[PDB]
Amino acid sequence: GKCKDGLGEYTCTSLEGF
Amino acid sequence: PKLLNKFDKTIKAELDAAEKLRKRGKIEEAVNAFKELVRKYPQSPRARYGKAQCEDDLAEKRRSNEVLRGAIETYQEVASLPDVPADLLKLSLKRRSDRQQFLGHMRGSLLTLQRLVQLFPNDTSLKNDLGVGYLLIGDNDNAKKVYEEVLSVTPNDGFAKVHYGFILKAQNKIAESIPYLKEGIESGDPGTDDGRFYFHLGDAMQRVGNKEAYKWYELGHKRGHFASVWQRSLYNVNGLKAQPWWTPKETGYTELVKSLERNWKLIRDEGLAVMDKAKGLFLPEDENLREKGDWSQFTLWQQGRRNENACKGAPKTCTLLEKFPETTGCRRGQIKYSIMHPGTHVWPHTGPTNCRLRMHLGLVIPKEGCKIRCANETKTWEEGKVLIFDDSFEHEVWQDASSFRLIFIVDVWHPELTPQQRRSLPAI
Numbered sequence: 001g002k003c004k005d006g007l008g009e010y011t012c013t014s015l016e017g018f
Numbered sequence: 019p020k021l022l023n024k025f026d027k028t029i030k031a032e033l034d035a036a037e038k039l040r041k042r043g044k045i046e047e048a049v050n051a052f053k054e055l056v057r058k059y060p061q062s063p064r065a066r067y068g069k070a071q072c073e074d075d076l077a078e079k080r081r082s083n084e085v086l087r088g089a090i091e092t093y094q095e096v097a098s099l100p101d102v103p104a105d106l107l108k109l110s111l112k113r114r115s116d117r118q119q120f121l122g123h124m125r126g127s128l129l130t131l132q133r134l135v136q137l138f139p140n141d142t143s144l145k146n147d148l149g150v151g152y153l154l155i156g157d158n159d160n161a162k163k164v165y166e167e168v169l170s171v172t173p174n175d176g177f178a179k180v181h182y183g184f185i186l187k188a189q190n191k192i193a194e195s196i197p198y199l200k201e202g203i204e205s206g207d208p209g210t211d212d213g214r215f216y217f218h219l220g221d222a223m224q225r226v227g228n229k230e231a232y233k234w235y236e237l238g239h240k241r242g243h244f245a246s247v248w249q250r251s252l253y254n255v256n257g258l259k260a261q262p263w264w265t266p267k268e269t270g271y272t273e274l275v276k277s278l279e280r281n282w283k284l285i286r287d288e289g290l291a292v293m294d295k296a297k298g299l300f301l302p303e304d305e306n307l308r309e310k311g312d313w314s315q316f317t318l319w320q321q322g323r324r325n326e327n328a329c330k331g332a333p334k335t336c337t338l339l340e341k342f343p344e345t346t347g348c349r350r351g352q353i354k355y356s357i358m359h360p361g362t363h364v365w366p367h368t369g370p371t372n373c374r375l376r377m378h379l380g381l382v383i384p385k386e387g388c389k390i391r392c393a394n395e396t397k398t399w400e401e402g403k404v405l406i407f408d409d410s411f412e413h414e415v416w417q418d419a420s421s422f423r424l425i426f427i428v429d430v431w432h433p434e435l436t437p438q439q440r441r442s443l444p445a446i
């Protein structure tokens with residue numbers, strides 16, 4: 001899932017280290 | 019904090035001498051010192067952990083994913099040595115899991131967490147960390163099982179309560195989620211003072227018709243999570259002009275707006291041809307934002323990536339929009355058609371970020387029945403005209419017409435974001 005129109009996911013961004 | 023086993027106690031002077039180099043910021047000297055200790059004492063858990071901590075610090079200093087991968091392996095090596103103190107074993111794998119999540123190795127993090135829980139089955143806090151592990155990969159079913167076991171042993175764990183409530187709400191069990199979120203936040207346990215839980219508690223209360231909802235928005239704002247009671251996005255850059263309704267001129271995107279309004283019928287006509295001949299490309303809204311009704315969207319750009327197959331269905335519109343990087347490069351927005359049918363009510367909600375402004379171009383607007391509220395002001399669409407609002411403010415939509423309503427949604431970067439921010443902000 002992605003946060004497009006709302007804030008429904010636990011996290012909306014993806015972690016890619018540094 | 020018992021970190022030394024029987025042997026490590028006899029070499030504590032050498033261990034301390036190495037750790038002193040690390041605490042004094044001499045990281046490169048520290049790594050070599052602990053490397054030498056590992057070479058000289060290959061079974062020392064404290065030496066191995068020192069090497070891992072130095073590698074960890076080195077990766078922060080150099081900002082290197084490759085060095086951090088090395089640290090993550092060394093943290094694991096600690097766990098396989100003989101006679102490791104329980105506190106050192108727990109610290110080592112916890113940091114390993116944490117660092118795996120930082121790198122985005124969520125499956126690896128989960129395995130580390132499953133090992134930690136198997137080794138320490140009475141540790142409630144490790145089960146809570148494992149539940150978070152599942153939530154990060156979107157596995158709400160397994161996260162739910164984990165917090166159920168925790169609430170079985172310790173019913174008033176406030177961290178388990180808010181995460182349990184979050185899951186129930188995400189599963190559309192609105193009324194059931196409210197006591198868990200509320201009691202969890204009111205517990206004040208570490209990790210419960212989080213904007214996500216105030217956001218979803220107030221929203222669940224709005225949906226059941228509970229006037230107390232705005233008390234939690236105001237408490238969330240007082241605690242620093244929301245910019246205001248109305249503006250409740252959580253992925254924000256501070257200082258951006260905050261205003262529910264914008265005129266074209268205030269945004270500075272006047273060339274884009276003129277282009278949309280001058281060419282609106284072409285945009286409409288490609289939208290209608292997709293409805294008539296390729297309506298499978300319109301996907302139903304899937305974020306639980308509807309009370310009732312039918313609402314579908316056909317997306318051309320998302321996270322600053324052009325959807326190639328979509329643009330085969332609206333090629334002139336995609337060609338027109340290519341000229342405007344302020345929307346096509348908006349990695350925190352979309353460009354999409356949005357169709358809404360009679361009998362639709364969209365719950366009050368906000369988007370995730372204050373870094374975009376949202377433009378609506380009217381395409382097919384019934385004469386009556388269609389309106390949009392943002393904050394305290396209700397407006398309606400006009401065919402061929404652009405409306406601009408900040409969807410990080412609470413907004414709500416009704417469709418009570420006698421036929422379908424089609425609009426075009428174009429997100430732009432907030433105009434006060436610098437070009438440095440536009441290229442470096444994580445995509446949403």
Ligand SMILES: O=C(O)CCC(=O)C(=O)O
Nearest residue numbers: 005356357358409415425
């Ligand atoms: O009216 C629409 O199609 C969508 C309304 C909405 O919630 C938004 O534009 O973010």
Ligand SMILES: [Fe+3]
Nearest residue numbers: 005369409413
């Ligand atoms: Fe919205």
